[PDB]
Ligand binder design. Structure first.
Ligand SMILES: Nc1ncnc2c1ncn2[C@@H]1O[C@H](COP(=O)(O)OP(=O)(O)NP(=O)(O)O)[C@@H](O)[C@H]1O
Ligand SMILES: Nc1ncnc2c1ncn2[C@@H]1O[C@H](COP(=O)(O)OP(=O)(O)NP(=O)(O)O)[C@@H](O)[C@H]1O
Ligand SMILES: Nc1ncnc2c1ncn2[C@@H]1O[C@H](COP(=O)(O)OP(=O)(O)NP(=O)(O)O)[C@@H](O)[C@H]1O
Ligand SMILES: [Mg+2]
Ligand SMILES: [Mg+2]
Ligand SMILES: [Mg+2]
Lengths: 315, 315, 315
């Protein structure tokens, strides 16, 4: 929310800052906690100019250091965007913490791309439905983008079909490095239009298909982190959910029941703690979908069943 | 799609052609669908004019953000290949939606290699009906391709037998490396004509015999992921509905997990998270075969009674 | 095929073929239809050299995409050796078609071993008469082989009877591995002398005793998969009708009120799809016996009153 428009004073030359901001650093906040090396990584950036920013942005930093009392203020404004139905919001303190990247984990049939569809409708509306009064960023690295589902959940919600369709900006991602730069492109529009979702689907999948072999798997984590830490940066720039969805490893050397690791974290590296919530979306009986949060800072763990009704999540 | 000859705008090197086509990439959109990592790995190609490859091919495709309304504007020409019967057409919401990848199960006598024949011959039909355009590439990796069935379903749909055979261009796969390279070259064989259907019959069949099991499993699923990723690239690359005929492992009951556990998708989670739709072609009396919809982001669970006869998948 | 004649040229060094001949590729089609992992373990010139060997084989065999018309033309020359009873000739539209596995299962006294003996006799007949003008490889693994039956069918078809037994080759599999070894030598046998019938009597009968027990030997279905893979390779290379036979296991399942007897062809999904057809013989009434049709890409369910007489199979 703080572009170069705020940081362009007291001798901040204009020529260097457009180039500095062009590489996804459009928000000056990124420059505020930017590595000194990164501050100079972009070509055309003057070194003396980078040293000047080292103090200008630093004094611009809104929260260089704070106490734990203001953490209550930083948490009370979270609207807890409602997951949906009844129990899916009843057991947990609140649907989705604004800024909580979270994580999805299920096999097929579960509907990882349907809870994300009902959440998409539950952002464009006011606090009357616990929405975020903003649009969505549909980062579907799959081909399962079904805004027909978004209109179907828009029918039972009873708002509209025009803006509920228009607002979500789909991010068709074929590459890993083109999804990372697309989300930089989104980082170059969240300044003007207020967002709260960044609904991400199977982000890890492209990394798995591309970064394949044995050693290249460390590069898979390296680039999974280049994406992930930037997701943390943005999701702290506003109160943006940035919900994530992951696939199944299915440990093979694992067996012995409750110890066979049926759904092994496809992202057990860096995301092991980065992912705020770890709902275990699992097919049950008929249309029930039980889930348990392995990691969820302000919750030990629970069990949560939700059905994929004709119009999205429903209990 | 865009011909690779069109990529000569910014003085693109003369012999960049063959070194680009070495990894398929027979279209401009093909490299537009591949990350910088592939191009770097490609020997001979080295680097273009200041990473032109990456900076370009974004200008000629909206690989950024559009709108679901625009997506709905393009989501009315999504051909739904008729099933041959009408009940499955009803369950399928028109048929086989394009820009995805279908899949089926059912072993012994269940009817997967005949629906893929009646589907190709009815995909050769014109745009106005459920046909759209045909000339499907039928990847036979088990040798089950009888063109007599094509003639059987040609009269059922008033199609010119000779023309029907001329349209469909089927091949024979032998091993996994032949499975993958066949479509890497099918890129080129599609770039000059109009195709709409890409049945990979008996998919994940070769992987079962080649890759033994424990101790070679990593390679199997990692080679399966490469296949699915490349196939998705093709589907997004020429807009072709891709049908998959998967086998089944009916031994999850090996641990007597629960009653009625005598079947399981053989591919594994890697393919499970790939296929958009997931059918299930169980067999009953005569030709009354139940087709369930394990996983389909558009259509809910349902069961119809498609009955292949002397004239194709009828009733 | 081509006996590595052209492969032993085009710069290709003999140092390659001498080592590759120690695994069982007595032709070039085996090398062409072999994954990198397969020929990378030759321990002889297995490297980029073997990659060039693969490319050489590819440019020495017809292997690429083609229109359906070519296959349609190459389906009017298939032998379709006559069974001996004109009922199963009407049922199979000519007889046992050459080129793919034709598993025929059942139980004791149904007539499988007798059908194989007759087929083995009829293969030598002139093609226009209904035979194949070839040879046979009875790979009997029970001990059932009685040349007296070949004698008896010889005068049925008015043959000399001497060459009836001089042409039919016979082996004896005493263990599971011995079947694979027999096929490995069989490849060479085809390489010199034409073969049109590769009967493996009770192929899934040694597995029932050697590879016995769930978990005791879960590698029963892996080895069976490799065995059937070898069968596909041989059938594809020399167009041999690999007429496998099978045993049966009763449905001890509580639902034993079912009809068709508690019949469940031994060998699970692994052996049920490599087979194109699946004739299910049952004891009808004395000499006259019923022959149903299971699975089958082409050929719907139908039966045949084949009678096993002293002359062989007839009416
Ligand atoms: N329009 C709909 N109405 C009702 N139920 C639906 C509808 N669309 C999908 N479903 C159900 O919800 C499920 C959604 O699965 P989906 O979200 O596609 O699978 P996933 O586990 O998220 N992974 P993938 O299939 O790889 O995208 C389906 O399998 C159906 O059971
Ligand atoms: N010379 C003959 N004349 C007439 N009928 C015969 C003659 N020899 C055998 N038969 C009949 O045909 C049957 C031949 O056995 P067959 O049914 O082919 O065994 P199988 O069940 O295939 N062998 P296996 O299952 O491996 O023990 C006999 O059981 C008799 O009913
Ligand atoms: N010409 C035909 N006319 C009518 N029905 C047929 C015809 N040919 C085969 N069938 C039926 O279709 C069934 C299934 O054939 P197919 O399409 O090969 O099944 P599948 O389950 O795909 N086979 P597999 O791939 O070996 O598991 C057969 O078992 C017959 O019941
Ligand atoms: Mg789902
Ligand atoms: Mg089919
Ligand atoms: Mg016999």
């Amino acid at each position: 929310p703080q572009p170069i428009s705020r940081l362009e004073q007291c001798g901040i030359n204009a020529n260097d800052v457009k180039k500095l901001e062009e590489a996804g650093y459009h928000t000056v906040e990124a420059v505020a906690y930017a590595p000194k090396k990164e501050l100079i990584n972009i070509k055309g950036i003057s070194e003396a100019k980078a040293d000047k920013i080292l103090t200008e942005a630093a004094k611009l930093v809104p929260m260089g250091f704070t106490t734990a009392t203001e953490f209550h203020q930083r948490r009370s404004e979270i609207i807890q965007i409602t997951t949906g139905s009844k129990e899916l919001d009843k057991l947990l303190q609140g649907g989705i913490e604004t800024g909580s990247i979270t994580e999805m984990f299920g096999e097929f049939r579960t509907g990882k791309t349907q809870i994300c569809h009902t959440l998409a409708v539950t952002c464009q509306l006011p606090i009357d439905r616990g929405g975020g009064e903003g649009k969505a960023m549909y980062i579907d690295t799959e081909g399962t983008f079904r805004p027909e589902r978004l209109l179907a959940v828009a029918e039972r919600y009873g708002l509209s079909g025009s803006d509920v369709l228009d607002n979500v900006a789909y991010a068709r991602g074929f590459n890993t490095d083109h999804q990372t730069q697309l989300l930089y492109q989104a980082e170059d529009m969240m300044v003007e239009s207020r967002y709260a979702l960044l609904i991400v689907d199977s982000a890890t999948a492209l990394y798995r298909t591309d970064y394949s072999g044995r050693g290249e798997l460390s590069a898979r984590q390296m680039h999974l982190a280049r994406f992930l830490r930037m997701l943390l940066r943005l999701a702290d720039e506003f109160g943006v959910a940035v919900v994530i969805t992951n696939q199944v490893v299915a440990q093979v050397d694992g067996a012995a029941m409750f110890a066979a690791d049926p759904k092994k974290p496809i992202g057990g590296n860096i995301i092991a703690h980065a992912s705020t919530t770890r709902l275990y979306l699992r097919k049950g009986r008929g249309e029930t979908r039980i889930c348990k949060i392995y990691d969820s800072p302000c919750l030990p763990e629970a069990e949560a069943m939700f059905a994929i009704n004709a119009d999205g999540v429903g209990d």
